[PDB]
Amino acid sequence: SMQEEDTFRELRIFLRNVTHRLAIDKRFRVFTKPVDPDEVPDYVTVIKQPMDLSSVISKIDLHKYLTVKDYLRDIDLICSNALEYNPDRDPGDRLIRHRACALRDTAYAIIKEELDEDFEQLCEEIQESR
Numbered sequence: 001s002m003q004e005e006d007t008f009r010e011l012r013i014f015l016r017n018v019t020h021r022l023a024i025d026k027r028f029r030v031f032t033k034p035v036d037p038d039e040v041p042d043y044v045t046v047i048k049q050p051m052d053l054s055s056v057i058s059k060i061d062l063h064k065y066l067t068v069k070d071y072l073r074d075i076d077l078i079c080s081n082a083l084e085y086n087p088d089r090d091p092g093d094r095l096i097r098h099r100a101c102a103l104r105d106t107a108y109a110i111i112k113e114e115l116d117e118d119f120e121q122l123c124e125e126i127q128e129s130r
């Protein structure tokens with residue numbers, strides 16, 4: 001229905017705003033665009049599902065997220081991809097893992113403080129009915 005389309009449009013607006021706040025945070029710069037294979041050649045072969053904040057914006061706009069849970073699965077993927085690709089003890093790997101974890105923690109914390117749980121519940125119920 002049109003009321004259901006209004007619900008998903010509100011969800012999209014909410015998701016774009018959270019994503020924008022992550023994207024402008026200096027710590028999360030390396031997650032703003034896809035990992036370039038010319039700068040990191042083995043990435044696309046090791047990481048099966050690359051994910052970054054620009055691709056998240058693209059997926060919001062294509063109506064790929066019908067719930068906050070679906071969006072958070074992609075935020076989790078930005079984090080898990082960095083934990084998997086950079087697992088070493090060296091400072092370079094530890095810094096990207098800490099930034100990855102901080103990106104995930106920030107997204108969850110924004111959603112915990114600003115998302116009405118009845119709004120998410122409505123999205124899930126419209127999703128389950130389709």
Ligand SMILES: COc1cc(C(=O)N2[C@H]3Cc4ccccc4[C@@H]2CNC3=O)cc(OC)c1O
Pocket residue numbers: 029030031032033034035036037039040081082085086096
């Ligand atoms: C997100 O995961 C990674 C990111 C980088 C990294 O420093 N990047 C990546 C992505 C990117 C995107 C926007 C701006 C800067 C950057 C820098 C430079 N070029 C890149 O391709 C390195 C990683 O491992 C060596 C790695 O797992």
